[PDB]
Structure formats: structure tokens, C-alpha cells
Design a protein around this ligand. Structure first.
Ligand SMILES: [Cl-]
Lengths: 273, 273, 273
């Protein structure tokens, strides 16, 4: 009277101590067990459970099932291991909305607030919005970087020439030895193994050594150098060249010749008295 | 007798074949259908369904609803794109906890373990912990990268100056001709078109050619150079200057003068016999 | 008759207006309230609520609970900040599957499709597959970058030391002064304060000034320089050294001596007539 049930099928059987069970062919064998509809079984004494649907099945201790051919699949789980979740978890029971051969979408759900709340598809999308933002940021950086590698790579291929041969297109030196050394104040040192030891000096050439204030050394005591292709000095502080000296040598030879003849004439007189 | 129901409202109607239905105004029209409470409708023969609440509504085949003005919204769904997946998903049914214009939070839920388990707000937080870690990693690299670009920029804007001008603040050459050439071992070549062909040599100046072991060439056969601002040599292996030579020229002129007078005196005698 | 309930416990009490309530010791105090099984309450002010299980508990307005010692924990919550949302959220009710002290895994669930669908552990795994992919990409870029910094520190620690010093391993100059200046066409200027003012000229040395076409200046009017370590000239356009000159000075001194003796002999004759 307020609980109608159209049927010509067999009796309901609420077998368990303190149990409830409604519907045709409904075998509730478990203590304090609920089950509702066409052959909703409460398997093994397996206690306190619930199955609410056509051919429903409560199989695990302290669990629930819901609907068509639904079954409890593991129930209470203790010291168990959840996905995305180091540290173990505890559970007081399962809640099935389906089966191992068949599952169910859980519609119309408000976005979780506290930690143990079902989270919906929207609350995920929000995360996945960032992953996306991030993934893009990465493609940029792989890109940006692949370029920096190229730029840096060129510097090593266009300057590398300069840092290794210590040379430029107009100040070249074919050598691989000791670094030039400009050791005195305002000194210049050109070429491997050169040394400008003195105030305001220049050491010009491989293993040149300038060891005296205000000089330009074209070599050393262990190895001098001739200077070549030098135009005749004109001013007082210009360098003289060999052709210039040659001129003087020439006048000296002319003199000696004159003195010879003079000596002859003086003999030619002395004796001709 | 153990199933009380306070009411003066109309009858329950468990209409469907094999169906159960309890509560006032509860119209269960569907076969093997359950529905419980104030006008909980099982719409269209739409089968095997369930609605458990005030004005509840089971509308889709094989589905469930729960609570105030709740409705099944799509039910079983075959080969359907599920969020985030890739391959199609199958579903035996829906389970509504609400409606299109009203939804419900699902509290007190143990963290999912297997793939088809509801995941809670905690299991998401764990993911979002990493997104955060990652996002920060990005901001760093963005920053670190930009810092490198600025660095590479400065190299590219300091080192270029050289690579084009072949010149540095302290070694300069106003020019745009042939790269200098240091072709001999340990040789030095300064300035466009210079050539240091010989062992241990220097070619000092535009189009200078030093073609002899142990020399410094200040030009070539096609164009020599004067060397200027040269102090008087003191040591044997110092370069002499013109004023120095001028001294010697001066003594020679004094000699010639003497020889003239001597010649006169010798004539002045010869003839005065 | 189709609703059996094995028990010797007290009566069910469907107290609330329009309410339903089945099972032993079941106190349904709330209007339009459902509750099913042993000792299940609907007290507090649990308007329209539901509890379906052993010792079940509907405590919050418009809410639901399900199973063993289950309780409604907050119910309808409006304009609450739920995890990850920024926007506030509305809710028509809670759905508990457990307790503040004890919770439940929700097995056998089809992957959510629309926004308000429970999402399963699988749908998360898909996300977390990318986070992983991304995290790896980061570790790479942190690496790739740590390299580039290395490579770039090096260039700075090689080249730019040039741009600061004006010096390469083989063209050094120990100086802070005025840049070099190569002002004439095809001119060369070496060292701080040097000036190559003239066509095709070289200014060799700190504050050297070459102000005449086709010259190499080793200094200036304000400060000249000796040139050292210079081999004896051989060719006409080679520079002469001092030892070369000393030889000529020596012959001149020999000549003057001769002329002295000649002069004496000439006097020795003149007067000896
Ligand atoms: Cl990420």
C-alpha cells in the first residue's frame, strides 16, 4: 500500500540478519544488506552491502553497486596504492556504477573543493590549459636556443680565427709559440716570444727583445735583423741607407788616391835633391 | 509494516513489467524500473532505469538519476569521444547526481587506483604541483636565455668592429685592400697587401714585401720608405741617422780642403825650383 | 508482500511530511525525506535529504549520503571557491559516499565527455604523460643552456679581453691611453696616441707621429727613438748600423794621421831650403 511491484515472478528473499530486500528474485543473503530489483544478489555473507538494479551484484565487504549487471570489484582497501600518489591510502568501501565488462559516465557533478572530492572534466581542463601554455613556452625555448647555439657557433668560427692565430686580416703572424709580451709601460710587442721590457719601447718581430727605454728592437743579441727597402734619409733624424754610405766610402777612396799621388810627388822631390 | 510513508497524496504506480516503485505520485512506466519518492518519473519505456528523489527523472535507457529535480541526460553512449582520450570510448549508461540547471559535489572519495576510477581533488593537486614546478623552470630559462642573447649581442657588436676593419683600438689601418699575408715561418705582416715571404721576417706597411730571412721590410723595390724620428745610434748594432752621417760628411769636406792646400804647396815648391 | 525485512528491532519512523522511510530504527524526521536501513538518521535540519545504508546520516539541507556510516558533510554550497576555478561556483547539493572519518573508491567509471562529468584515473594519466614529456624537455634545456653559458663565458674570457686591452696574444700593448689613429690613406698606426697622418705611412710606437708620405716613424719631434739589433746593411736600400760607421770613422782617423805626417814633411822641406 504505497509500494507497488508488477510481477508474476518468484518471491523476494531478505535472508540476512537485520537485512532489507525488495523486488522479484532478489536474494539478499548478507547481514544488514540492501538490494533492490530483478535478482540483485548479495554474494558471500560479505557484509552490509547494497545492489540497486536489474541483475545487480554486491560482492565485496562493505561496498555498493548501482544498476544493470553492476558488481562490486574490490570494496574496502587498506594500506593501498593510488595513482599519482606516493604514500598509501585507506578506504572504507567501493562504490560501483558499472562493471569489469562495462562502465558508466557520472554526469552533473559540481567542481570539487576539498581534497577527497570527485574532480570534474572542467577542473582538469584548467590544468591542461597550463600544460599547453607551458608546452608552447618550451617549443619557443628549444627554438630560441637552437638559434643561440647557431650565433655562438659562428662567433667560434669567425673569431676563432682571431683568438687562435692571434691575428687579424691586417696584422698577421704565422707562428704558434710564446705569447707576445709588452712588459714595460707604454710598450709594444709584436710576435711570438717578443719582449718589450723597457719604458716606451717596441719589440718588432718573433723573439725580438727591446730592453732599453725609447728604442725599437728589430731583434736581439742572439739574433739581429737587417732592415730593408729604406729610402735615403733626408732629415737629420732620418735613417741613412747603404747607398748613402757607399757615397762616403767612394769619396774616401778618391782621397786615398789623391794622397798616393801626393806622396809620390813628395818622394819625387826629396830624392830629386 | 516496516516501510512507513506519511502522506495524503495520490497512489504510487509501478506500471512497468517486473518494476518496483515506492512513494507518492511516483510513476514508474519502464520495465524493470526503480523509482523512489515524490513524483519520481521513469520517462519513456526507457528501460531498467532509476530515480531516487523529489521530482526525480529517469529519461535515458539503462541510466540512473539521484535527488531533487535530477534527470538522466544521455545514458548509454557507444563509441564516443571521451575527454582527453584518443581512441573511442564505450559506455553502458549514465549516472546523474543532478541536472542541466543544478549540480552536486561528490564528497568523501578515496583516491582512484585503476584507470576507470573517479579521481579526487587531491590526485589533481599532485599533478598541479609539477605544472607549477615546471612553470617556474620556464620563467627561469626564459630569463636565462634572454641574458644569453644580450651577451651574444654584445660580442656580435664589439667583435664585428674588428672582423671588418682588421684593426683594434691600438693597431689600426685605414684601408680596404688585400688581407695581409704572413707566409714564411715565424713571420709578421702588417697592413693590406703586405707579404712576409721569408723565414722569421717582418713586412711593415701597406704593400711591403720582406723576401729575405731575418729582415724587416719597410717597403719594396716598387716603393721604398724613409724611416723617420730616429735617435743617434750608440751601440754597434744600432741604426745610424742622417745627422750622424752629416758629421762624417763634414770631416771629409775638411779633409778635401786640407788636401787642396797641400796640393798648392806642392805645386808652389815644384815650380819654385 | 514483496518487501521483506528480517528483524526483531524497533519500528521504522517516517516522521516528516510527505516522507518515506524503510528499515529498523530508521528515523526520518525531515520533510520529503528518504532513508533506508539500520539506525539511519535524517535529523539536523535535513530538508528533503536521503541516506541509504547501515547507520546512514543525512545532515545537510538538500543533500544525499550512501552506505555504511556515511554522512552529508556540507550540502548545498553557493558561491564557494572550488579548487582551480578562479570563478566562484554554485551547488544544489552534496552527495557523500563516506565520511569525514572514512571514504570510498568509485570504481567502474566511463571516461568523462562533457565538462561536469566525473573524470577517471585514465583521463588524468593522459595529462600526466605530457607533464612528464615536458619535465624532460626542461631538464634538457637547463642542460643545453648550462652549456651555452659555458661556451659564451669562454668567448668573453678570450676575445673581449682584446677589445679591452687592444691586444692579441701576438700584438700586445701595455697601455691605457688614447686609441691609435691611422688617419692617412693606407696608413698604419701602432700603439696609444700614435698618429699616421700621411699617405701610406706607419706610426710605430706609443705617441709616434708619421707626418710625411712614405715614411715609418719610430717616434716624433718631442721624443725620438733609437733602433736596435740591426744587422749590417748589404744592399743599397738596406739600413746601415753603427759598427758599419765606426769602421769608416776609423779610416778617416787613419787618413788625418797620414795628412799630418805629410804636412810635416812638406814643412820639413820648405824650411830646409
Ligand atoms: Cl607543464
Amino acid at each position: 500500500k504505497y509500494y507497488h511491484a508488477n510481477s508474476t515472478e518468484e518471491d523476494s528473499l531478505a535472508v540476512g540478519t537485520d537485512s532489507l530486500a525488495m523486488g522479484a528474485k532478489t536474494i539478499v543473503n548478507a547481514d544488514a544488506g540492501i538490494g533492490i530489483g530483478l535478482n540483485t544478489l548479495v554474494m558471500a555473507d560479505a557484509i552490509n552491502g547494497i545492489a540497486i538494479g536489474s541483475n545487480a551484484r554486491a560482492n565485496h565487504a562493505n561496498s555498493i553497486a548501482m544498476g544493470n549487471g553492476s558488481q562490486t570489484t574490490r570494496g574496502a582497501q587498506t594500506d593501498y596504492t593510488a595513482y599519482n600518489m606516493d604514500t598509501p591510502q585507506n578506504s572504507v568501501g567501493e562504490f560501483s556504477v558499472g562493471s569489469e565488462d562495462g562502465q558508466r559516465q557520472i554526469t552533473n557533478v559540481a567542481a570539487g573543493s576539498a581534497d577527497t572530492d570527485a574532480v570534474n572534466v572542467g577542473q582538469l581542463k584548467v590544468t591542461d590549459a597550463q600544460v599547453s601554455r607551458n608546452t608552447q613556452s618550451i617549443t619557443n625555448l628549444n627554438t630560441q636556443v637552437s638559434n643561440l647555439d647557431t650565433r655562438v657557433t659562428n662567433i667560434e668560427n669567425g673569431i676563432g680565427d682571431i683568438v687562435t692565430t692571434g691575428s687579424t686580416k691586417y696584422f698577421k703572424t704565422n707562428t704558434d709559440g710564446a705569447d707576445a709580451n709588452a712588459q714595460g709601460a707604454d710598450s709594444v710587442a709584436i710576435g711570438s716570444g717578443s719582449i718589450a721590457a723597457a719604458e716606451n719601447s717596441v719589440a718588432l718581430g718573433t723573439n725580438s727583445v727591446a730592453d732599453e727605454a725609447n728604442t725599437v728592437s728589430v731583434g736581439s743579441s742572439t739574433q739581429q735583423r737587417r732592415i730593408t727597402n729604406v729610402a735615403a734619409g733626408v732629415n737629420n733624424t732620418d735613417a741613412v741607407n747603404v747607398a748613402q754610405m757607399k757615397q762616403i766610402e767612394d769619396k774616401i777612396e778618391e782621397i786615398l788616391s789623391k794622397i798616393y799621388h801626393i806622396e809620390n810627388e813628395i818622394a819625387r822631390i826629396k830624392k830629386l835633391i
